[PDB]
Amino acid sequence: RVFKKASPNGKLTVYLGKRDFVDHIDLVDPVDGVVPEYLKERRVYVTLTCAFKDLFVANVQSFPPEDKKPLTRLQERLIKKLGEHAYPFTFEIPPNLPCSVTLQPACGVDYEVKAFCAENLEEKIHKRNSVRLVIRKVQYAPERPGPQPTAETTRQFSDKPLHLEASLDKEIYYHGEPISVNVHVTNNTNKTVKKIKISVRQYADICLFNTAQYKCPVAMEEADDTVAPSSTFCKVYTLTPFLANNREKRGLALDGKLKHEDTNLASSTLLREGANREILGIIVSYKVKVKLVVSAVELPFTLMHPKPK
Amino acid sequence: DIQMTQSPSSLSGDRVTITCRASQSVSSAVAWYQQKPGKAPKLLIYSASSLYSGVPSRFSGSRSGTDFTLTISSLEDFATYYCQQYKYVPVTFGQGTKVE
């Protein structure tokens, strides 16, 4: 089932067989679709764009040899459906680029598909004749779980240092699920500590001229579980991420949005290779900060949806 | 309120199919559920085509425009079957079709 949007003049139509295009970590799926007796100029253009500033822009014309990218499976079915005035187009989406993710009021990055007619790009478009689509490059959790993302710190003061010991079930979590934070401190110190603070913070990397980072919590529980000195403590906690308890937090990262929607929080999205190459746009991720109050440990975890069936 | 409606009302391993009518465009937002009266519904189909885990292969979701439908290619299937609609809030189950 292909979405179609038709131009104000009613001449032009653009087809995209979907707009939640997948990524495989190694490569991003190329866009494909179907775009003159009105536009006597006898030519049409597809422009694929990501915009936050347009991060990247590419241009192709389905109508009327150097663009003969071989016809994709569903796209040929579309041509056969439409006939003589139907012409294929496709885009090699470059990797090293974001997914569709937005900011809480759509702000953030967005992918714009603009199909229009003209004699050449140098000529200005007319709203009377184009179709504008918005799309979502999206990425789903690896099938391979990470390590049990344990972290420890024997915070030293009391000759026997205070021990902070922490574990989760997974680095790779599904969205809307709890996190079974499982912690085992050892308070062999000569003092008491009253409150253990369990939190999840969204960290959001943004870069357009410099690497900018901004963070705020999206899951919280306060545990007054005072651990006495010369004592070790053991119980599992439970946080869970959801956007309702934080609607007031301006600029918090949310998932892709087409025009206006309450699609849930922004999913963390992966880097490519071990190169840590500085991708432009938005990257976010989550860590479980458990902090014993003075009288801290974080366990990194990727959060994103499972692979849709 | 999409007054989605369902036919036939009833009928008696044999192949069968059931159809519902949408009052407006509702995209793929349909479901199908098999209920034995006295028991809670259990989901068969999502987005009018996709078989849910563990469902027998007999249950194939079908569509033609605002025509949604179901094909049980072979009838425990003497049971009540509901179509659905959910693109717009509120949802609206239909009158349901039994089998014998």
């Binding site: 089932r1 292909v2 579309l78 | -």
Partner: peptide, 10 residues
Amino acid sequence: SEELTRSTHC
């Protein structure tokens, strides 16, 4: 000002 993104199935 009043386009629409209806669907179509091949």
